[PDB]
């Protein structure tokens, strides 16, 4: 589990949004595992805004934050899981790094803030959602 705060938004995986996000929906998209609802508190999180590929993140199956190298945002064939088909995911980075069902929401973070979170992993392969293209995050 784990989300981003940044504003008056909620950066969720889509695949654990929860009842109260779809009612307050801003924006989902399928293709890459994400959604966003409004909050009523302003959040902490300022979003990256860059091409970083090292940085940090939060792996909750080992209460621990590694340090990785990841691919830029590209288009990866994601293996059927519980909660989508075998399909392209879309704005997807890929690390060398532990993963569970759970990881998901983790944060992965570079020197200039957010970049993306956990979304899908195994056999040593951890996958990120990225936000940094997300503009509009940082306003309204
Ligand atoms: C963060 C994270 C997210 C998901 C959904 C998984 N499990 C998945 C993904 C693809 N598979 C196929 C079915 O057996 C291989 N299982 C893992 C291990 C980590
Ligand atoms: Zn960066």
């Not at 996000?21 to 959040?43: F, M």
Request: hydrophobic fraction near 35%; glycine fraction near 10%.
């Amino acid at each position: 589990s784990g989300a981003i705060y940044v504003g008056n938004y909620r950066v969720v995986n889509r695949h654990l949004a929860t009842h109260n996000d779809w009612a307050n929906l801003v924006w989902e998209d399928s293709s890459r595992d994400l959604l966003v609802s409004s909050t009523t508190a302003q959040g902490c999180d300022t979003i990256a805004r860059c091409d970083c590929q090292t940085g940090v993140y939060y792996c909750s199956s080992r209460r621990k934050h590694y340090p990785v190298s990841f691919s830029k945002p590209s288009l990866i064939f994601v293996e059927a899981s519980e909660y989508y088909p075998a399909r392209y995911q879309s704005h997807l980075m890929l690390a060398v790094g532990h993963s569970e069902p759970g990881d998901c929401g983790g944060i992965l973070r570079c020197q200039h803030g957010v970049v993306g979170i956990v979304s899908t992993g195994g056999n040593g392969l951890v996958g990120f959602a990225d936000v940094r293209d997300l503009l509009w995050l940082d306003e309204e």
